[PDB]
Amino acid sequence: VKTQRVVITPGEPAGIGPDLVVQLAQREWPVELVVCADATLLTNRAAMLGLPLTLRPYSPNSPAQPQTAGTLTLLPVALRAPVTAGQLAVENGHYVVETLARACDGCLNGEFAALITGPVHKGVINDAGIPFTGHTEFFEERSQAKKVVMMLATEELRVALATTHLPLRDIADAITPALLHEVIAILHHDLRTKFGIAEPRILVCGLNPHAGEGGHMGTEEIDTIIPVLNELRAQGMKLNGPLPADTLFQPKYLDNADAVLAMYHDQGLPVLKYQGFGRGVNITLGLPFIRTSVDHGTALELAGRGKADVGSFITALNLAIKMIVNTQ
Amino acid sequence: VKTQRVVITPGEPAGIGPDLVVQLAQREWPVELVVCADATLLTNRAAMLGLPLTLRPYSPNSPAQPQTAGTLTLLPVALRAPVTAGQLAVENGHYVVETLARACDGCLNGEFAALITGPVHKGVINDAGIPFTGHTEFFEERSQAKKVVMMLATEELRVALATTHLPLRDIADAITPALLHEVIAILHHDLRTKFGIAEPRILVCGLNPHAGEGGHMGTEEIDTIIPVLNELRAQGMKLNGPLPADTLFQPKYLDNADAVLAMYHDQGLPVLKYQGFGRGVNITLGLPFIRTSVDHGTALELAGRGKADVGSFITALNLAIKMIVNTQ
Numbered sequence: 321v322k323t324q325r326v327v328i329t330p331g332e333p334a335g336i337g338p339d340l341v342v343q344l345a346q347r348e349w350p351v352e353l354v355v356c357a358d359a360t361l362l363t364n365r366a367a368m369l370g371l372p373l374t375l376r377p378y379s380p381n382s383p384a385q386p387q388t389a390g391t392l393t394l395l396p397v398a399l400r401a402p403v404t405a406g407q408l409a410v411e412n413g414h415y416v417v418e419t420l421a422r423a424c425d426g427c428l429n430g431e432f433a434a435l436i437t438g439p440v441h442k443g444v445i446n447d448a449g450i451p452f453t454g455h456t457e458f459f460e461e462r463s464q465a466k467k468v469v470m471m472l473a474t475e476e477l478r479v480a481l482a483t484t485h486l487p488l489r490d491i492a493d494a495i496t497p498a499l500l501h502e503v504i505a506i507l508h509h510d511l512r513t514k515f516g517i518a519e520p521r522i523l524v525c526g527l528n529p530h531a532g533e534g535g536h537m538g539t540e541e542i543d544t545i546i547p548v549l550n551e552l553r554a555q556g557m558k559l560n561g562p563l564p565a566d567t568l569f570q571p572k573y574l575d576n577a578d579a580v581l582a583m584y585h586d587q588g589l590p591v592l593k594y595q596g597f598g599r600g601v602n603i604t605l606g607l608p609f610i611r612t613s614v615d616h617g618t619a620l621e622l623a624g625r626g627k628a629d630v631g632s633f634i635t636a637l638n639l640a641i642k643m644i645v646n647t648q
Numbered sequence: 649v650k651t652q653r654v655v656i657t658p659g660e661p662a663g664i665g666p667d668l669v670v671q672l673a674q675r676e677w678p679v680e681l682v683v684c685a686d687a688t689l690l691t692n693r694a695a696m697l698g699l700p701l702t703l704r705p706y707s708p709n710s711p712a713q714p715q716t717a718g719t720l721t722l723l724p725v726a727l728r729a730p731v732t733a734g735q736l737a738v739e740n741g742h743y744v745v746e747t748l749a750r751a752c753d754g755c756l757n758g759e760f761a762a763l764i765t766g767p768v769h770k771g772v773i774n775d776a777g778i779p780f781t782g783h784t785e786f787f788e789e790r791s792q793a794k795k796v797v798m799m800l801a802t803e804e805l806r807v808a809l810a811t812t813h814l815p816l817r818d819i820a821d822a823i824t825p826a827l828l829h830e831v832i833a834i835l836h837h838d839l840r841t842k843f844g845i846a847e848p849r850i851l852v853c854g855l856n857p858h859a860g861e862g863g864h865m866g867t868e869e870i871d872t873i874i875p876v877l878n879e880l881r882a883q884g885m886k887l888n889g890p891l892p893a894d895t896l897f898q899p900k901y902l903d904n905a906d907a908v909l910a911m912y913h914d915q916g917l918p919v920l921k922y923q924g925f926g927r928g929v930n931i932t933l934g935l936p937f938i939r940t941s942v943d944h945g946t947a948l949e950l951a952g953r954g955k956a957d958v959g960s961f962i963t964a965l966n967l968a969i970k971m972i973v974n975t976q
């Protein structure tokens with residue numbers, strides 16, 4: 321075997337991302353942590369946190385080495401303008417996107433085994449003149465993936481979303497057999513390839529409350545969800561549902577499920593989030609490479625102040641690492 | 649101070665209601681338990697269950713006495729036909745309705761401090777030729793309430809819904825400024841008068857994911873929810889602005905709030921039910937009196953078995969009692 325490299329994008333410079341990566345670095349890792357950011361950004365934020373940091377250069381033509389405590393490997397990307405923790409600078413929006421692109425191309429070219437992302441501020445990137453709606457869409461497009469699936473996990477409890485950031489009013493018409501097929505196909509695929517689960521068991525939420533309670537509250541279950549599920553069950557897929565979302569999240573269901581598929585954003589994320597603020601991991605399924613992420617914002621207000629909380633970033637990294645085994 | 653009386657309606661005679669009430673009786677209570685039902689029904693179901701039961705008559709002229717274990721106070725209403733657990737008899741629909749009317753009237757008279765309802769089967773009542781649009785609708789209409797708001801609580805969390813059992817595709821257009829003002833006024837009002845919370849703190853969910861994030865994920869927050877909340881805040885009402893549902897359910901928020909207002913069914917109930925479950929109690933806001941209700945159905949398939957589970961009924965009663973204590 322060979323020591324693996326993972327690429328990490330701290331995210332918004334003025335945000336908590338660099339703070340968190342400097343903190344990640346205070347411990348040992350079984351992989352080489354290739355951080356794609358500006359060297360000075362990290363050096364300065366480290367100082368502000370009274371934390372030690374020595375950076376070694378990313379060297380593609382030398383073997384990778386596990387990351388020792390107090391260090392990080394650096395894939396340099398220059399900042400557009402000077403940084404002040406907590407204050408945004410539109411020009412640095414190009415900087416952020418650049419790190420994302422480079423880290424993404426590194427996973428596509430096989431340079432890196434996984435990609436872990438810090439938080440980014442969508443607003444400032446747009447302000448810079450760059451259409452950006454989030455990492456998920458960014459990688460999906462740059463990776464030219466047919467379709468990606470957003471997942472949230474806290475360990476055994478994993479929730480995927482059939483639809484993501486759509487206005488509530490657009491969800492219903494979005495639930496088509498075509499969409500359910502791709503999403504579930506990907507969910508089933510990745511649970512096997514990336515999560516190492518031979519025969520994955522997926523728990524599916526209905527669209528309406530009470531899963532449509534017959535026909536009194538919506539026809540989507542009887543019209544498209546149920547039919548598709550049985551089309552897939554015949555394909556050998558182990559699927560349970562559709563079930564009511566406020567009943568589905570129980571031991572008699574979860575204990576025998578490897579993942580839950582929610583029809584929409586606020587149907588599945590609240591329970592997961594209430595299951596623990598930190599320790600929550602964002603995962604993108606459907607990409608050619610493993611991509612995990614923190615499950616929180618840039619928290620400009622905390623940047624450089626040292627009240628961090630690297631729990632989510634650390635779990636994100638541990639998961640990506642554990643995931644590398646199943647793919648390599 | 650003085651011992652209060654609460655009225656309980658076992659509900660559908662053939663369902664588990666009577667079973668649940670006979671078990672409730674096996675323990676002492678700080679209030680007098682007035683059960684509006686047919687004596688024989690209760691006596692018999694007690695036999696079938698191997699549980700002891702002594703019924704004392706409702707004596708409004710006497711001082712209310714806390715209920716002693718193995719006993720119940722009876723407000724007599726006669727069945728129209730013999731009851732066979734697990735079998736619906738249309739004729740008895742008239743019985744169910746009469747108990748509901750009598751209990752309701754008693755709550756408007758001041759005879760009873762609160763109403764705790766057992767499960768009722770709508771179908772059989774309608775099949776009997778009795779117009780009845782639903783359990784809570786009956787009390788809403790008879791008490792002349794203009795609007796009721798459904799809430800689910802567990803001692804550690806209270807969640808009210810702006811909309812209830814509607815198809816998902818109908819929620820967006822239902823969230824109007826009128827509905828919200830009406831829903832929040834009632835929620836603010838009752839948190840004071842029924843829960844005894846002076847200066848109530850309310851958390852409000854946005855309709856869209858990330859609360860519409862600016863307006864990149866929907867406009868309802870900007871066009872309706874935010875304007876409404878602002879007006880109400882102008883009246884001193886403590887309202888924590890529209891927060892993304894997936895971040896709202898967390899200590900920094902919940903620990904600072906008395907109630908959470910969710911926009912739709914699956915946005916609040918899953919968290920509430922994962923945070924407790926059976927501990928869940930349905931409270932009807934908007935009526936002139938306190939009304940709690942079990943969380944299950946008539947479950948005719950369980951009546952007369954012995955595997956009832958008066959748990960939910962107990963948390964329902966316990967909750968109404970507390971509400972009485974904090975409002976006297």
Ligand SMILES: N[C@H](C(=O)O)[C@H](O)COP(=O)(O)O
Binds near residue numbers: 457589894
């Ligand atoms: N709702 C997701 C979460 O809970 O983290 C978040 O929007 C994902 O954003 P990205 O596409 O930027 O990873």
Ligand SMILES: [Zn+2]
Binds near residue numbers: 857858
């Ligand atoms: Zn999101």
Ligand SMILES: [Zn+2]
Binds near residue numbers: 530813913
């Ligand atoms: Zn419901």
